[PDB]
Amino acid sequence: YDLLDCHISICSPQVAQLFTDNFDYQTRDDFVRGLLVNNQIHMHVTAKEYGARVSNLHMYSAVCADVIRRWVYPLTPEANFTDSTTQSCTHSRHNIYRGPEVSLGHGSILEENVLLGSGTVIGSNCFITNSVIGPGCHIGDNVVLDQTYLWQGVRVAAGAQIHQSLLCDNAEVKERVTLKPRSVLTSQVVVGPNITLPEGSVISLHPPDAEEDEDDGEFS
Amino acid sequence: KELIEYFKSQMKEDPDMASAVAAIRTLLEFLKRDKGETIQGLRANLTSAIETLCGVDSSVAVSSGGELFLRFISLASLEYSDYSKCKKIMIERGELFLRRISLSRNKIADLCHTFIKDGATILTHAYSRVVLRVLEAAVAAKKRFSVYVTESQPDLSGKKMAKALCHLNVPVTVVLDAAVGYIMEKADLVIVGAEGVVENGGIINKIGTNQMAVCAKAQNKPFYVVAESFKFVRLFPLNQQDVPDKFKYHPWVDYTAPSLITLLFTDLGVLTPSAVSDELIKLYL
C-alpha cells in the first residue's frame, strides 16, 4: 500500500506499437490496465530519493515544502543550475536563503525555511515561516505569511494577516486582508480593506468559473 | 618643542583621524624644514629627538609609530650620487607610506565587515576609530544584528560610541562596565579595537579588555581584535607589571594575555596568534 504513481515511464517503441493497436487508448492508465487482460511489466521501488508530480495545487505546496527543507539534494536551488544572476541567494541557519537586494527590516524576524528573490523590498516586524517569497516583492509591517506563494511583481500592504495562500503574478492586496487556508489569487487581483475573506475563493479574470469578473474581487 | 604646537594643531584641527597618524603627518610635513643639509645627524638623531619630544603625551601608539616610520624611511633613503635628491627632494616614499596607511582603514573596512554573523549580538568596547568604519561597511551591506557598548570607565566613553553610531540609524544600548559578565552569555562573539598590538599576540588598549577575553574563554566564545599597520610595538609583557610606566598612564591603557584571543585582523591581513610574531618581524628587517 506504500507507493505513489508519478509517470517516469522508461519504455521502448514496442509500447508505440501497443498504442497503435488500441486507438481508444489515451493515457498511461489504460496502457497498464490493458496489460492486465491476458507485453509484460515490472515496477522498481527504491529507498533513496523523492520523485513525484503535481497537476493540483495541494501536493504542489507539499513538494515546495520538500524542496526548501531539501528532500531533493543533490538538486538544491542555491547551486543555481539555471543560468542568470537573478536567483543569487545563499544559505544561512535553518535552511533559509537570502537573494540579492535583500533589505530585511529592523526586528523583522524570518525564522524557518524560506527564500526571497530579486527586488524583494522587505519591511520591518514581519514573521514568515515554511513558505516562499519570490522576486518582485514589497512588504509593509507585521505582514505575516505562512506557507504562501508570492510570485513575480506582487505587492502587499501592512498588517495583511494571511495564512496558507497561493498567489500569482503582479497582484495587489490592501490593509487588514485577513485570509484563510486553501484559496488562490491570480493575475492582477486588487482587494481593498477589511475583507476577512473565507476559506476557498478562486479569484481571477474569468466570469463563469472563477469567482470574480474582469474588475476587482470585492463586489461586481 | 618648537613644532609640538603643530602636533597640537594636528590633533585638534581634524579630530577624525588617529593620534599617531597626526604625528606622522606633522613631522613629514616638517621635512620642508630649516635645511640641516645632512643625512646622518638630521635623519637619525634629529628625528630621534623629535620622537622623544612628541612622546611626552600618554600615548603608546605614537612613539611606536614614529619608530615605525623611521623604519619605513630606513628602507632606501639611499646615498644616491649627490646631496640634492637623497630624501629632502625624493621625499615621496614617505608620502606613499602615508597614503597607503591612510587607505589602510578603507581596506580593513573592505575586508572585515563580511565576517559578522547576522543574528548574534556583539558587544563592543569603547570608541575606536576602526570599529566605526567596519560597522559602517557592514550595515552598508544590509545586515541585521544588535550591538552593545561598555562604558570603559575612568570616564564615560561608551556613550561616545553611542553618539558615534546613532547618527546613522543603527540600534545600540550602553551597558554597565563591571557588569559585562551578565551580558557575556547574551553576546556570542566580541570585537574590540586597539591602542596597539604586542609581539606575543595580545593587545594593548584601554582597560576593559582582559576581563572580556577571560569571560570569552569561560563562555568558550570567540574573542576578536582589530588593529592597523600603525599600531605595532616591540613590548613584551608576562604579567601586567612590565608594560613601561610611561606607557601605563590605575592604568589608562592595558594589556590582555596573548593567546586567549581567537583571531586577529591587521593591514597585513587576517592572521593567527603566532603569525603575529613573524609578520611583525617582516617589518624592520
PDB file of C-alpha atoms in Angstrom, chain A:
ATOM      1  CA  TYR A   1       0.000   0.000   0.000  1.00  0.00           C
ATOM      2  CA  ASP A   2       3.039   2.282   0.320  1.00  0.00           C
ATOM      3  CA  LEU A   3       3.943   3.700  -3.110  1.00  0.00           C
ATOM      4  CA  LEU A   4       2.695   6.539  -5.377  1.00  0.00           C
ATOM      5  CA  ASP A   5       2.265   6.948  -9.150  1.00  0.00           C
ATOM      6  CA  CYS A   6       4.366   9.540 -10.942  1.00  0.00           C
ATOM      7  CA  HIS A   7       4.732   8.938 -14.767  1.00  0.00           C
ATOM      8  CA  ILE A   8       8.501   8.401 -15.319  1.00  0.00           C
ATOM      9  CA  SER A   9       7.958   5.559 -17.787  1.00  0.00           C
ATOM     10  CA  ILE A  10      11.106   4.138 -19.295  1.00  0.00           C
ATOM     11  CA  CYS A  11       9.995   2.170 -22.346  1.00  0.00           C
ATOM     12  CA  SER A  12      10.806   1.189 -25.909  1.00  0.00           C
ATOM     13  CA  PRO A  13       8.820   1.619 -29.182  1.00  0.00           C
ATOM     14  CA  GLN A  14       7.125  -1.721 -28.752  1.00  0.00           C
ATOM     15  CA  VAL A  15       4.939   0.422 -26.474  1.00  0.00           C
ATOM     16  CA  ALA A  16       4.500   2.691 -29.512  1.00  0.00           C
ATOM     17  CA  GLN A  17       3.008  -0.233 -31.388  1.00  0.00           C
ATOM     18  CA  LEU A  18       0.900  -1.255 -28.387  1.00  0.00           C
ATOM     19  CA  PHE A  19      -0.840   2.085 -28.687  1.00  0.00           C
ATOM     20  CA  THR A  20      -1.021   1.887 -32.397  1.00  0.00           C
ATOM     21  CA  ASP A  21      -3.056  -1.211 -31.504  1.00  0.00           C
ATOM     22  CA  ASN A  22      -5.813   0.307 -29.336  1.00  0.00           C
ATOM     23  CA  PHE A  23      -6.636   3.700 -30.843  1.00  0.00           C
ATOM     24  CA  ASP A  24      -9.021   4.343 -27.938  1.00  0.00           C
ATOM     25  CA  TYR A  25      -6.025   4.334 -25.592  1.00  0.00           C
ATOM     26  CA  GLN A  26      -5.408   7.852 -24.297  1.00  0.00           C
ATOM     27  CA  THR A  27      -3.433   7.668 -21.032  1.00  0.00           C
ATOM     28  CA  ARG A  28      -0.863   5.521 -19.271  1.00  0.00           C
ATOM     29  CA  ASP A  29      -3.659   4.150 -17.091  1.00  0.00           C
ATOM     30  CA  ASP A  30      -5.375   2.207 -19.843  1.00  0.00           C
ATOM     31  CA  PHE A  31      -1.954   1.119 -21.136  1.00  0.00           C
ATOM     32  CA  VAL A  32      -1.120  -0.527 -17.827  1.00  0.00           C
ATOM     33  CA  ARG A  33      -4.690  -1.798 -17.465  1.00  0.00           C
ATOM     34  CA  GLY A  34      -4.542  -3.231 -20.975  1.00  0.00           C
ATOM     35  CA  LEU A  35      -1.500  -5.121 -19.798  1.00  0.00           C
ATOM     36  CA  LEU A  36      -3.659  -6.946 -17.270  1.00  0.00           C
ATOM     37  CA  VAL A  37      -6.191  -8.583 -19.612  1.00  0.00           C
ATOM     38  CA  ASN A  38      -4.069 -11.515 -20.849  1.00  0.00           C
ATOM     39  CA  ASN A  39       3.782  -7.498 -23.250  1.00  0.00           C
ATOM     40  CA  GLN A  40       4.746  -7.570 -19.563  1.00  0.00           C
ATOM     41  CA  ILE A  41       5.578  -5.045 -16.827  1.00  0.00           C
ATOM     42  CA  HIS A  42       7.671  -4.634 -13.688  1.00  0.00           C
ATOM     43  CA  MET A  43       7.970  -1.845 -11.167  1.00  0.00           C
ATOM     44  CA  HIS A  44      11.031  -0.512  -9.419  1.00  0.00           C
ATOM     45  CA  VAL A  45      10.834   0.671  -5.826  1.00  0.00           C
ATOM     46  CA  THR A  46      13.827   2.483  -4.348  1.00  0.00           C
ATOM     47  CA  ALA A  47      14.975   3.644  -0.913  1.00  0.00           C
ATOM     48  CA  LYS A  48      16.942   6.799  -1.607  1.00  0.00           C
ATOM     49  CA  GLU A  49      15.155   9.638  -3.395  1.00  0.00           C
ATOM     50  CA  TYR A  50      11.985  11.652  -3.961  1.00  0.00           C
ATOM     51  CA  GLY A  51      10.186  11.652  -7.306  1.00  0.00           C
ATOM     52  CA  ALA A  52       6.599  12.817  -7.734  1.00  0.00           C
ATOM     53  CA  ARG A  53       4.470  15.251  -9.693  1.00  0.00           C
ATOM     54  CA  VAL A  54       1.550  17.656  -9.389  1.00  0.00           C
ATOM     55  CA  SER A  55      -1.301  18.871 -11.542  1.00  0.00           C
ATOM     56  CA  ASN A  56      -3.084  20.182  -8.456  1.00  0.00           C
ATOM     57  CA  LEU A  57      -2.016  22.916  -6.108  1.00  0.00           C
ATOM     58  CA  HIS A  58      -2.037  20.796  -2.947  1.00  0.00           C
ATOM     59  CA  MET A  59       0.869  18.450  -3.491  1.00  0.00           C
ATOM     60  CA  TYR A  60       2.496  21.397  -5.264  1.00  0.00           C
ATOM     61  CA  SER A  61       2.576  23.034  -1.848  1.00  0.00           C
ATOM     62  CA  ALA A  62       3.818  19.717  -0.452  1.00  0.00           C
ATOM     63  CA  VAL A  63       6.634  19.401  -2.997  1.00  0.00           C
ATOM     64  CA  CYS A  64       7.617  23.022  -2.433  1.00  0.00           C
ATOM     65  CA  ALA A  65       7.876  22.208   1.258  1.00  0.00           C
ATOM     66  CA  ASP A  66      10.017  19.244   0.165  1.00  0.00           C
ATOM     67  CA  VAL A  67      12.292  21.486  -1.914  1.00  0.00           C
ATOM     68  CA  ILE A  68      13.095  24.079   0.725  1.00  0.00           C
ATOM     69  CA  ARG A  69      13.840  21.729   3.620  1.00  0.00           C
ATOM     70  CA  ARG A  70      15.715  19.862   0.879  1.00  0.00           C
ATOM     71  CA  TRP A  71      14.462  16.345   0.374  1.00  0.00           C
ATOM     72  CA  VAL A  72      15.866  16.664  -3.170  1.00  0.00           C
ATOM     73  CA  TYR A  73      19.616  17.069  -2.638  1.00  0.00           C
ATOM     74  CA  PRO A  74      21.864  16.990  -4.896  1.00  0.00           C
ATOM     75  CA  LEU A  75      19.323  19.170  -6.681  1.00  0.00           C
ATOM     76  CA  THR A  76      19.270  22.246  -4.482  1.00  0.00           C
ATOM     77  CA  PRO A  77      18.084  25.715  -5.594  1.00  0.00           C
ATOM     78  CA  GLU A  78      21.226  27.525  -4.391  1.00  0.00           C
ATOM     79  CA  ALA A  79      23.642  25.856  -6.744  1.00  0.00           C
ATOM     80  CA  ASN A  80      21.556  27.933  -9.208  1.00  0.00           C
ATOM     81  CA  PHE A  81      21.766  25.492 -12.086  1.00  0.00           C
ATOM     82  CA  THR A  82      19.760  27.637 -14.454  1.00  0.00           C
ATOM     83  CA  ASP A  83      21.929  30.470 -15.621  1.00  0.00           C
ATOM     84  CA  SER A  84      21.325  34.041 -14.503  1.00  0.00           C
ATOM     85  CA  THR A  85      22.200  36.212 -11.522  1.00  0.00           C
ATOM     86  CA  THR A  86      18.509  36.797 -10.822  1.00  0.00           C
ATOM     87  CA  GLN A  87      18.472  33.752  -8.498  1.00  0.00           C
ATOM     88  CA  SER A  88      21.576  34.652  -6.484  1.00  0.00           C
ATOM     89  CA  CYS A  89      20.751  33.511  -2.943  1.00  0.00           C
ATOM     90  CA  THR A  90      22.945  31.953  -0.241  1.00  0.00           C
ATOM     91  CA  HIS A  91      22.324  29.714   2.745  1.00  0.00           C
ATOM     92  CA  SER A  92      22.016  30.511   6.463  1.00  0.00           C
ATOM     93  CA  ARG A  93      20.670  28.974   9.665  1.00  0.00           C
ATOM     94  CA  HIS A  94      17.513  26.832   9.442  1.00  0.00           C
ATOM     95  CA  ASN A  95      17.713  26.339   5.635  1.00  0.00           C
ATOM     96  CA  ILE A  96      16.733  29.938   4.884  1.00  0.00           C
ATOM     97  CA  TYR A  97      18.004  31.804   1.843  1.00  0.00           C
ATOM     98  CA  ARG A  98      18.521  35.491   1.038  1.00  0.00           C
ATOM     99  CA  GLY A  99      18.802  36.754  -2.518  1.00  0.00           C
ATOM    100  CA  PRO A 100      20.088  39.997  -3.991  1.00  0.00           C
ATOM    101  CA  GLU A 101      18.963  43.457  -2.749  1.00  0.00           C
ATOM    102  CA  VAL A 102      17.609  41.845   0.408  1.00  0.00           C
ATOM    103  CA  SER A 103      16.710  44.856   2.666  1.00  0.00           C
ATOM    104  CA  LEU A 104      15.454  42.965   5.684  1.00  0.00           C
ATOM    105  CA  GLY A 105      13.648  45.098   8.237  1.00  0.00           C
ATOM    106  CA  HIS A 106      14.673  46.089  11.744  1.00  0.00           C
ATOM    107  CA  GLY A 107      13.481  43.405  14.148  1.00  0.00           C
ATOM    108  CA  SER A 108      11.850  41.643  11.185  1.00  0.00           C
ATOM    109  CA  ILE A 109      12.423  38.053  12.250  1.00  0.00           C
ATOM    110  CA  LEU A 110      12.457  35.478   9.476  1.00  0.00           C
ATOM    111  CA  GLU A 111      12.851  32.096  11.014  1.00  0.00           C
ATOM    112  CA  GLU A 112      12.250  28.880   9.092  1.00  0.00           C
ATOM    113  CA  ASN A 113      12.651  27.574   5.598  1.00  0.00           C
ATOM    114  CA  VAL A 114      12.082  30.499   3.239  1.00  0.00           C
ATOM    115  CA  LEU A 115      13.839  32.303   0.418  1.00  0.00           C
ATOM    116  CA  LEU A 116      13.493  35.559  -1.482  1.00  0.00           C
ATOM    117  CA  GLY A 117      14.469  36.730  -4.949  1.00  0.00           C
ATOM    118  CA  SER A 118      15.273  39.943  -6.775  1.00  0.00           C
ATOM    119  CA  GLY A 119      13.781  43.339  -5.952  1.00  0.00           C
ATOM    120  CA  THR A 120      12.258  41.945  -2.747  1.00  0.00           C
ATOM    121  CA  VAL A 121      11.912  45.012  -0.542  1.00  0.00           C
ATOM    122  CA  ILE A 122      11.063  43.796   2.950  1.00  0.00           C
ATOM    123  CA  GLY A 123       9.525  45.959   5.627  1.00  0.00           C
ATOM    124  CA  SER A 124      10.004  45.595   9.364  1.00  0.00           C
ATOM    125  CA  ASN A 125       8.448  43.419  12.072  1.00  0.00           C
ATOM    126  CA  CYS A 126       7.132  40.715   9.737  1.00  0.00           C
ATOM    127  CA  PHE A 127       7.102  36.995  10.562  1.00  0.00           C
ATOM    128  CA  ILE A 128       7.330  34.317   7.885  1.00  0.00           C
ATOM    129  CA  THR A 129       7.812  30.553   8.169  1.00  0.00           C
ATOM    130  CA  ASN A 130       7.743  27.482   5.868  1.00  0.00           C
ATOM    131  CA  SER A 131       6.970  29.464   2.723  1.00  0.00           C
ATOM    132  CA  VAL A 132       8.411  31.017  -0.425  1.00  0.00           C
ATOM    133  CA  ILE A 133       8.516  34.670  -1.337  1.00  0.00           C
ATOM    134  CA  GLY A 134       9.707  35.112  -4.897  1.00  0.00           C
ATOM    135  CA  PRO A 135      11.053  38.150  -6.733  1.00  0.00           C
ATOM    136  CA  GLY A 136       9.163  41.375  -7.271  1.00  0.00           C
ATOM    137  CA  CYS A 137       8.066  41.772  -3.676  1.00  0.00           C
ATOM    138  CA  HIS A 138       7.212  44.625  -1.344  1.00  0.00           C
ATOM    139  CA  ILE A 139       6.217  44.271   2.299  1.00  0.00           C
ATOM    140  CA  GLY A 140       4.544  46.574   4.804  1.00  0.00           C
ATOM    141  CA  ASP A 141       4.832  45.903   8.511  1.00  0.00           C
ATOM    142  CA  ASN A 142       3.551  42.927  10.537  1.00  0.00           C
ATOM    143  CA  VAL A 143       2.919  41.204   7.203  1.00  0.00           C
ATOM    144  CA  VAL A 144       2.787  37.612   8.394  1.00  0.00           C
ATOM    145  CA  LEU A 145       2.940  34.896   5.764  1.00  0.00           C
ATOM    146  CA  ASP A 146       2.595  31.156   6.293  1.00  0.00           C
ATOM    147  CA  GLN A 147       3.013  28.504   3.559  1.00  0.00           C
ATOM    148  CA  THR A 148       2.276  31.218   0.994  1.00  0.00           C
ATOM    149  CA  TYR A 149       3.494  31.820  -2.571  1.00  0.00           C
ATOM    150  CA  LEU A 150       4.397  35.295  -3.787  1.00  0.00           C
ATOM    151  CA  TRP A 151       5.476  35.199  -7.427  1.00  0.00           C
ATOM    152  CA  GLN A 152       6.748  37.967  -9.708  1.00  0.00           C
ATOM    153  CA  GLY A 153       5.543  41.527  -9.221  1.00  0.00           C
ATOM    154  CA  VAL A 154       3.455  41.001  -6.080  1.00  0.00           C
ATOM    155  CA  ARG A 155       2.581  43.693  -3.558  1.00  0.00           C
ATOM    156  CA  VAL A 156       1.008  43.511  -0.108  1.00  0.00           C
ATOM    157  CA  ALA A 157       0.085  46.215   2.376  1.00  0.00           C
ATOM    158  CA  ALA A 158       0.872  46.397   6.076  1.00  0.00           C
ATOM    159  CA  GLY A 159      -0.934  44.244   8.603  1.00  0.00           C
ATOM    160  CA  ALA A 160      -2.270  41.822   5.978  1.00  0.00           C
ATOM    161  CA  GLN A 161      -2.551  38.809   8.276  1.00  0.00           C
ATOM    162  CA  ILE A 162      -2.665  35.983   5.723  1.00  0.00           C
ATOM    163  CA  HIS A 163      -2.272  32.214   6.173  1.00  0.00           C
ATOM    164  CA  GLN A 164      -1.921  29.402   3.617  1.00  0.00           C
ATOM    165  CA  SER A 165      -2.270  31.171   0.295  1.00  0.00           C
ATOM    166  CA  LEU A 166      -1.331  30.608  -3.329  1.00  0.00           C
ATOM    167  CA  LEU A 167      -0.773  33.791  -5.209  1.00  0.00           C
ATOM    168  CA  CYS A 168       0.453  34.736  -8.644  1.00  0.00           C
ATOM    169  CA  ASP A 169       1.817  37.483 -10.929  1.00  0.00           C
ATOM    170  CA  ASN A 170       1.714  41.258 -10.200  1.00  0.00           C
ATOM    171  CA  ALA A 171      -1.065  41.263  -7.626  1.00  0.00           C
ATOM    172  CA  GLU A 172      -2.039  43.859  -5.013  1.00  0.00           C
ATOM    173  CA  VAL A 173      -3.718  43.383  -1.636  1.00  0.00           C
ATOM    174  CA  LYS A 174      -4.525  46.177   0.793  1.00  0.00           C
ATOM    175  CA  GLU A 175      -4.573  46.650   4.588  1.00  0.00           C
ATOM    176  CA  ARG A 176      -6.159  44.151   7.044  1.00  0.00           C
ATOM    177  CA  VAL A 177      -6.962  41.493   4.461  1.00  0.00           C
ATOM    178  CA  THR A 178      -7.283  38.509   6.761  1.00  0.00           C
ATOM    179  CA  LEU A 179      -7.320  35.465   4.520  1.00  0.00           C
ATOM    180  CA  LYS A 180      -7.990  31.805   5.160  1.00  0.00           C
ATOM    181  CA  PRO A 181      -6.422  28.487   4.031  1.00  0.00           C
ATOM    182  CA  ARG A 182      -6.843  26.659   0.703  1.00  0.00           C
ATOM    183  CA  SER A 183      -7.529  29.536  -1.680  1.00  0.00           C
ATOM    184  CA  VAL A 184      -5.866  31.146  -4.694  1.00  0.00           C
ATOM    185  CA  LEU A 185      -5.315  34.612  -6.203  1.00  0.00           C
ATOM    186  CA  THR A 186      -4.110  35.119  -9.765  1.00  0.00           C
ATOM    187  CA  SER A 187      -3.256  37.724 -12.427  1.00  0.00           C
ATOM    188  CA  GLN A 188      -3.664  41.307 -11.140  1.00  0.00           C
ATOM    189  CA  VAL A 189      -6.111  40.940  -8.264  1.00  0.00           C
ATOM    190  CA  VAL A 190      -6.993  44.064  -6.280  1.00  0.00           C
ATOM    191  CA  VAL A 191      -8.688  43.646  -2.892  1.00  0.00           C
ATOM    192  CA  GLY A 192      -9.214  46.582  -0.552  1.00  0.00           C
ATOM    193  CA  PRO A 193      -9.505  46.958   3.203  1.00  0.00           C
ATOM    194  CA  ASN A 194     -11.459  44.997   5.825  1.00  0.00           C
ATOM    195  CA  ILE A 195     -12.050  41.911   3.691  1.00  0.00           C
ATOM    196  CA  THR A 196     -11.876  38.940   6.045  1.00  0.00           C
ATOM    197  CA  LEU A 197     -12.037  36.576   3.078  1.00  0.00           C
ATOM    198  CA  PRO A 198     -13.318  32.999   3.665  1.00  0.00           C
ATOM    199  CA  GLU A 199     -11.680  29.584   3.230  1.00  0.00           C
ATOM    200  CA  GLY A 200     -11.747  28.949  -0.504  1.00  0.00           C
ATOM    201  CA  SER A 201     -12.203  31.571  -3.210  1.00  0.00           C
ATOM    202  CA  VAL A 202     -10.716  31.288  -6.687  1.00  0.00           C
ATOM    203  CA  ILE A 203     -10.465  34.924  -7.773  1.00  0.00           C
ATOM    204  CA  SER A 204      -9.341  35.635 -11.348  1.00  0.00           C
ATOM    205  CA  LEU A 205     -10.363  37.280 -14.622  1.00  0.00           C
ATOM    206  CA  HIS A 206     -12.783  34.581 -15.851  1.00  0.00           C
ATOM    207  CA  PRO A 207     -16.515  35.052 -15.093  1.00  0.00           C
ATOM    208  CA  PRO A 208     -18.063  31.571 -15.352  1.00  0.00           C
ATOM    209  CA  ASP A 209     -15.738  29.520 -13.083  1.00  0.00           C
ATOM    210  CA  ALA A 210     -13.535  31.952 -11.162  1.00  0.00           C
ATOM    211  CA  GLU A 211     -15.442  33.913  -8.533  1.00  0.00           C
ATOM    212  CA  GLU A 212     -14.720  37.407  -9.760  1.00  0.00           C
ATOM    213  CA  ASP A 213     -15.142  39.203 -13.082  1.00  0.00           C
ATOM    214  CA  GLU A 214     -12.754  41.313 -15.175  1.00  0.00           C
ATOM    215  CA  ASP A 215     -12.983  44.004 -12.461  1.00  0.00           C
ATOM    216  CA  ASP A 216     -11.819  43.549  -8.842  1.00  0.00           C
ATOM    217  CA  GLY A 217     -12.949  40.851  -6.409  1.00  0.00           C
ATOM    218  CA  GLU A 218     -14.844  42.570  -3.607  1.00  0.00           C
ATOM    219  CA  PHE A 219     -18.104  43.125  -5.500  1.00  0.00           C
ATOM    220  CA  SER A 220     -19.219  43.360  -9.120  1.00  0.00           C
TER     221      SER A 220
END
